[PDB]
Amino acid sequence: PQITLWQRPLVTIKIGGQLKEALLDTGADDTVLEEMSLPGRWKPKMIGGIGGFIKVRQYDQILIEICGHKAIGTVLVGPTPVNIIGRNLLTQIGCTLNF
Amino acid sequence: PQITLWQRPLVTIKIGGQLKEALLDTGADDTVLEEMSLPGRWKPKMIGGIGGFIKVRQYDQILIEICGHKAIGTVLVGPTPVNIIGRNLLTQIGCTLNF
């Protein structure tokens, strides 16, 4: 698809059975989901942004589906205000920025 | 141009006869620049990010050129880790997300 930025670029993801809304975000290096339960072991991590840093759990090799496209990679889970798809999975579905 | 997201989408902007680097960020509603001096009067604004809220200054009608495309609009100044080009100016240069 081609997406305009007059509104926020929100999409439906499928994440282990659940459907969610998420933000396609080129300014995020990583994908960060709101607090949820994932299968697997994890590592703590700190990520920072506007307003400072938060602690997240790092999960590896999670399959996500972003508009039909499935992608695999690292997912961070934590007290983010919104679900965010970052550059790590955007690349996997062939996302580019165009003008 | 078409930008891929394997690296950060950093570009050069020009504001006030200075060149600076900035991130193209579709996850940002507005444009936020590191601490600097702009023309005119400002008003107060609060923005929320990953880590919390910050208080910024809002200057209206600023000209930026981004990659040789010039835009005029609202820019916020405050303590951001990087200069950020958000959706208000990304729409003015015709930027879309594609996959």
Ligand SMILES: *[C]C1(*)(*)([C](*)*)S[C]([C](C(=O)[N][C]C2=[C][C]=[C][C]=[C]2)N(*)[C@](*)(=O(*)*)[C@@](*)(*)C2(*)(*)(*)(*)=[C@](*)(*)C(*)=[C]C(*)=[C@@]2(*)*)[N@@](*)(*)[C@@]1(*)C(*)(*)(*)(*)(=O(*)*)N(*)(*)(*)C(*)(*)(*)(*)([C@@](*)(*)C1=C(*)[C@@](*)(*)=[C@@](*)(*)[C]=C1*)C(*)(*)(*)(*)([O])[C@@](*)(*)C(*)(*)(*)(*)(*)(=O*)[N@](*)(*)C(*)(*)(*)C1(*)(*)=[N@@](*)(*)C2(*)(*)(*)=C(*)(*)(*)([N@@]1(*)*)C(*)(*)(*)(*)=[C@](*)(*)C(*)=C2*
């Ligand atoms: C996405 C987000 C987080 S969300 C926010 C927004 C919304 O929607 N909401 C909330 C609010 C409310 C009220 C008020 C305000 C807010 N908003 C917006 O958009 C506003 C703004 C503008 C500009 C800026 C900011 C804000 N928010 C958002 C954000 O924050 N985003 C971001 C930006 C940035 C970039 C860079 C730096 C800083 C910031 C993005 O997009 C994402 C992020 O966060 N990034 C950073 C990072 N992250 C991560 C990293 N880094 C690494 C790793 C992982 C993750």
